[PDB]
Design a protein around this ligand. Structure first.
Ligand code: CLA
Ligand code: CLA
Ligand code: CLA
Ligand code: CLA
Ligand code: CLA
Ligand code: CLA
Ligand code: CLA
Ligand code: CLA
Ligand SMILES: CCCCCCCCCCCCCCCCC[C@@H](O)O[C@@H](COCC[C@H](C(=O)O)[N+](C)(C)C)CO[C@@H](O)CCCCCCCCCCCCCCCCC
Ligand SMILES: CC1=C(/C=C/C(C)=C/C=C/C(C)=C\C=C\C=C(C)\C=C\C=C(C)\C=C\C2=C(C)CCCC2(C)C)C(C)(C)CCC1
Ligand code: SF4
Ligand code: SF4
Lengths: 165, 97, 41, 67, 143, 80
């Protein structure tokens, strides 16, 4: 009940929107015979809509004055009202995946530079090496913070290409 | 005077030139060093007048490219006919257009 | 074989392979989990 | 003359010229001129500049070791 | 070269029709440029002011309104037929100035007879900042 | 007209003079380079500022520099 908003199950506009969607799906369904493929397609669409509306309810989602669910982004407030699974857990998961991408790209950049014509390896990818680095990135934060600890993650300002002042 | 003039097997069907992206021009044959090379790979692909100065090779490339475009067009037409055959209501449309 | 493999090892081909792989993974996830919005186990 | 006016040929050098494209970059010494020109150190670089060239002439005071 | 040649207006022009991108009123108000060459035979060349002309076996004289057109024709004749032409500049009052072969050996050579001017003896990037030269009328590159 | 300035980093490769479409540069004898040549601009009043000489310079940065300003009839490339 934060931000002056009501839960989706307790709200009336949420149920009104669900009823309107079911009504227009039934209006589209009534134009087809029950023994036709569009009838089964529309029945599956209605079942998916009902399942989605049931899953959005009883999951902590809340909507304000329009029946459209709202998401709470501040940690702590989302922790004490069971809204962490809205954005807090997905943002951590996306950070994990983005760090996976960055670590894999960094490993491929570093590991394909101690050879003749590194641009050729950049343009024609070493597929077994790329797959090996792909399956070795599951521990990206450990290796990242260890490279930070030993100083190989960052380059010194003496070996870095720099623009004139 | 007018007769068929054809050379037999001037180019061997090998994948050795598929590995090298920049091969049609000597400027791109040295390999890439900047990203503007890559666009130059996709810009001078059909610039057959710049790859070679021989008109015969350019004409052969033009003939092959026209055959490829006709094949692409026929693929698109066959796909259109297939979509009309299966994922369509043409039979229903014929009853009441 | 190895020339065709190096052609398949070129950047657009492996990018295409990644594109089909990621698109198919996300599409199958959306199909077998129809329209989720909030992580609720 | 005695020894050589510049560094050993084929050795890596770091360019200290601020206006150069290869400032704080590692290049290879091709040849060092001994006549007494202003920029005798010919350095070849692995990465080309915007003009597409990869070699430049630098003086003795703008080259150091690769750190 | 050893002696600066003098232009001859009576030299025959190359065989050509009418040009549209030819000399404008600036030719009779300001200076205009005139290119001379020595063709050993008759051949077809492309003018920078239009289509194509045919040069005569002998001296050939052409008129232009821009020095860039004269040097473009000069380098076309040098690259295509190795002609080595030369163009003068004629003002409204009739003053004739020798322009391209200043020492007669072309600027690609040295000839050990030209004094280098407008040459800064410091390296580029060693010039002073514009704050150093302020309210003086002197640019940082002009010192 | 425009200002053409040539520094001591020039190697006397004569590329700027060949790239010049108005015959502004020249080669003078020199002792500061291996080729014993130095670029000069004795005809800077005819330069239009096309910067074609800067494209042909092989040295890093530029051994020849063109600065625009105070355009005239010759500097504006006008046939009229
Ligand atoms: C800088 C961004 C930012 C902002 C504007 C807020 C804003 C808020 N947080 Mg949050 N918070 C943040 C980042 C932020 N948070 C981060 C990065 C963490 C650590 C993961 C937390 C952990 C946190 C806790 C543990 C709590 C808040 C609470 C609050 C509320 C009151 C804060 C206060 O001092 O009283 C307010 C909605 C409190 C709340 O919900 O209100 C009582 C609360 O208990 N926050
Ligand atoms: C499905 C939903 C979704 C989608 C499609 C995207 C899409 C995108 N996000 Mg993400 N994001 C999402 C949800 C989503 N976001 C959520 C829920 C959160 C939590 C708040 C974030 C937080 C987030 C951050 C913090 C960043 C992005 C960025 C990006 C963009 C580029 C990613 C990149 O460079 O490649 C993958 C990543 C790399 C190749 C390099 C790795 C860089 C990552 C961010 C570092 C991760 C480790 C690091 C130490 C964690 C701290 C991050 C720091 C900012 C505090 C991309 C458009 C980035 C962006 O737009 O930058 C311009 C970026 O920095 N996202
Ligand atoms: C009869 C058809 C025909 C043929 C055989 C050619 C053949 C040629 N043309 Mg010409 N041209 C044509 C039609 C044709 N053109 C038309 C209709 C136009 C006007 C639009 C042009 C405009 C044109 C220009 C301006 C130039 C050429 C050039 C060329 C040469 C190389 C082309 C190349 O390498 O492209 C390689 C292929 C590409 C660069 C891909 C182009 C993709 C476009 C930009 C975007 C496609 C959008 C697509 C419809 C939707 C995508 C959506 C996205 C979400 C996926 C070659 C001689 C070039 C040349 O040097 O000539 C010698 C050149 O400079 N042509
Ligand atoms: C004009 C060319 C053209 C175009 C634009 C399409 C486009 C399409 N067709 Mg295909 N089709 C084509 C030619 C074409 N086709 C040809 C030539 C054939 C005969 C071999 C087919 C046979 C065919 C079948 C049998 C089916 C499609 C289907 C499809 C759709 C999804 C395909 C897809 O990504 O599946 C994923 C494919 C890969 C990841 C690979 C898409 C709208 C499907 C569809 O519409 O579903 C109802 C479908 O079932 N098409
Ligand atoms: C317009 C300019 C431009 C252009 C043309 C490119 C083009 C390219 N750069 Mg570049 N880049 C640019 C600007 C540009 N970049 C800028 C401004 C920056 C920031 C400074 C970078 C930073 C950068 C980095 C750090 C890297 C590139 C890479 C690449 C390549 C990406 C394609 C690729 O990896 O295919 C492959 C694409 C895939 C999706 C394959 C991923 C691996 C799969 C998932 C494995 C499994 C495949 C299987 C079939 C399934 C390509 C050559 C990358 C490279 O050289 O290739 C590794 C690379 O590491 N660039
Ligand atoms: C069939 C026509 C066709 C088309 C549409 C393309 C299109 C493309 N190719 Mg090219 N290519 C072709 C034929 C074609 N190619 C042929 C015949 C050859 C000779 C074998 C090549 C060789 C070639 C090389 C060697 C490279 C390309 C690259 C590229 C990309 C241009 C750079 C870019 O997007 O910015 C830069 C883009 C990025 C930095 C993004 C990197 C990450 C992306 C998301 C992964 C790539 C996925 C891709 C976009 C989607 C699948 C491919 C797409 C065409 C369906 C673009 C996707 C470059 C590339 O890999 O760029 C992707 C590259 O290095 N191509
Ligand atoms: C690379 C991404 C990817 C992934 C992970 C999947 C995964 C799946 N697909 Mg899918 N598929 C993909 C791409 C992908 N597909 C593409 C590109 C196409 C178009 C050609 C299809 C076309 C397709 C069809 C037509 C069917 C599947 C089915 C399936 C499931 C059973 C197959 C199986 O045992 O796989 C390993 C799975 C491990 C969990 C599985 C969830 C089948 C299904 O519904 O499952 C019963 C099914 O009928 N897929
Ligand atoms: C960058 C902003 C952003 C964000 C945060 C989201 C986030 C979301 N959208 Mg959206 N979307 C976006 C941009 C964005 N999208 C854009 C630009 C488009 C237009 C191309 C769409 C089109 C779109 C559609 C059509 C649908 C979504 C859906 C979704 C959900 C993700 C479903 C999924 O990928 O399977 C989950 C997959 C994973 C968790 C990957 C797991 C992989 C390993 C295991 C980790 C989620 C609520 C779907 C949904 O459920 O609606 C709520 C849906 O139906 N979006
Ligand atoms: C492994 C497990 C992989 C995941 C299996 C998931 C499991 O729910 O799918 C069932 C069908 O229910 C889902 C229907 C689907 C949906 O609603 O999303 N819809 C779109 C097709 C409506 C299989 O039922 C038949 O489809 C089986 C056909 C033969 C399969 C052979 C390979 C089996 C695996 C090996
Ligand atoms: C909780 C949360 C939140 C908040 C947050 C925050 C507040 C943050 C901050 C943050 C910060 C304040 C940060 C900072 C940073 C800094 C720095 C300096 C960084 C760096 C980084 C790096 C260097 C990285 C790297 C990498 C890459 C990129 C690739 C590879 C891998 C790695 C990771 C290594 C919000 C509400 C939003 C949402 C929900 C959740
Ligand atoms: S192009 Fe540059 S290095 Fe070459 S002669 Fe001219 S100023 Fe000197
Ligand atoms: S800007 Fe053009 S006209 Fe002027 S000196 Fe350079 S190349 Fe010659």
């Amino acid at each position: 009940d934060v931000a002056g908003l009501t839960p989706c199950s307790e709200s009336k506009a949420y149920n009104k929107l669900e009823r309107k969607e079911l009504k227009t799906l039934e209006k589209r369904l009534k134009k087809y015979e029950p023994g036709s493929a569009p009838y089964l397609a529309l029945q599956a669409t209605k079942e998916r809509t009902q399942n989605r509306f049931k899953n959005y309810a009883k999951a902590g989602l809340l909507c304000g004055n329009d029946g459209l669910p709202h998401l709470i982004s501040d940690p702590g407030l989302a922790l004490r009202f069971n809204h962490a699974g809205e954005v807090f857990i997905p943002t951590f998961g996306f950070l994990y995946v983005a760090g996976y991408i960055g670590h894999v790209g960094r490993q491929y950049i570093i590991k394909s530079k101690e050879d003749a014509k590194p641009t050729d390896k950049e343009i024609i990818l070493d597929v077994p090496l790329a797959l090996q680095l792909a399956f070795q990135g599951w521990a990206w934060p450990l290796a990242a913070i260890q490279e930070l600890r030993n100083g190989s993650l960052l380059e010194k300002d003496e070996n870095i290409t720099v623009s004139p002042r | 005077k007018v007769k068929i003039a054809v050379d037999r097997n001037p180019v061997e069907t090998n994948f050795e030139k598929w590995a090298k992206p920049g091969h049609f021009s000597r400027a791109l044959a040295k390999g890439p060093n900047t990203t503007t090379w890559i666009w130059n790979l996709h810009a001078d692909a059909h610039d057959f007048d710049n790859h070679t100065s021989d008109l015969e090779e350019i004409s052969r490339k033009v003939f092959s490219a026209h055959f490829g475009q006709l094949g692409i067009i026929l693929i698109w037409l066959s796909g259109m006919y297939f979509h009309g055959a299966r994922f369509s209501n043409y039979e229903g449309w014929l009853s009441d257009p | 074989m190895k020339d065709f493999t190096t052609y398949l090892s070129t950047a657009p081909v492996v990018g295409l392979g990644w594109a089909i792989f990621t698109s198919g993974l996300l599409i199958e996830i959306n199909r077998f989990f129809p329209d989720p919005l909030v992580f609720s186990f | 003359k005695k020894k050589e006016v510049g560094p050993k040929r084929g050795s890596l050098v770091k360019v200290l010229r601020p206006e150069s494209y290869w400032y704080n970059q590692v290049g290879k010494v091709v040849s060092v001129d001994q006549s007494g020109i202003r920029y005798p150190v010919v350095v070849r670089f692995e990465n080309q500049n915007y003009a597409g060239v990869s070699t430049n002439n630098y003086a003795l005071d703008e080259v150091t070791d690769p750190p | 070269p050893w002696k600066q040649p003098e232009l001859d207006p009576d030299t025959p022009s190359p065989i050509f029709g009418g040009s549209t991108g030819g000399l404008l009123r600036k030719a009779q108000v300001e200076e205009f440029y005139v290119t001379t060459w020595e063709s050993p035979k008759e051949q077809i060349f492309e003018m920078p002011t239009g289509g194509a002309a045919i040069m005569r076996k002998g001296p050939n004289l052409l008129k232009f309104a821009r020095k860039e057109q004269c040097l473009a024709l000069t380098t076309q004749l040098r690259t295509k037929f190795k002609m080595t032409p030369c163009f003068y500049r004629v003002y409204a009052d009739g003053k004739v100035e020798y322009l391209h072969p200043k020492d007669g050996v072309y600027p690609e050579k040295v000839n050990a007879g030209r004094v280098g001017v407008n040459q800064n003896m410091r390296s580029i990037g060693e010039n002073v900042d514009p704050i150093k030269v302020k309210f003086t009328g002197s640019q940082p590159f002009t010192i | 007209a425009h200002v053409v300035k040539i520094y001591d980093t020039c190697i006397g490769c004569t590329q700027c003079v060949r790239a010049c479409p108005l015959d502004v540069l020249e080669m003078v004898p020199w002792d500061g380079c291996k080729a014993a040549q130095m670029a000069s601009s004795p005809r800077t009043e005819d330069c239009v500022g096309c910067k074609r000489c800067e494209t042909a310079c092989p040295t890093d940065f530029l051994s020849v520099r063109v600065y625009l300003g105070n355009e005239s009839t010759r500097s504006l490339g006008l046939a009229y």
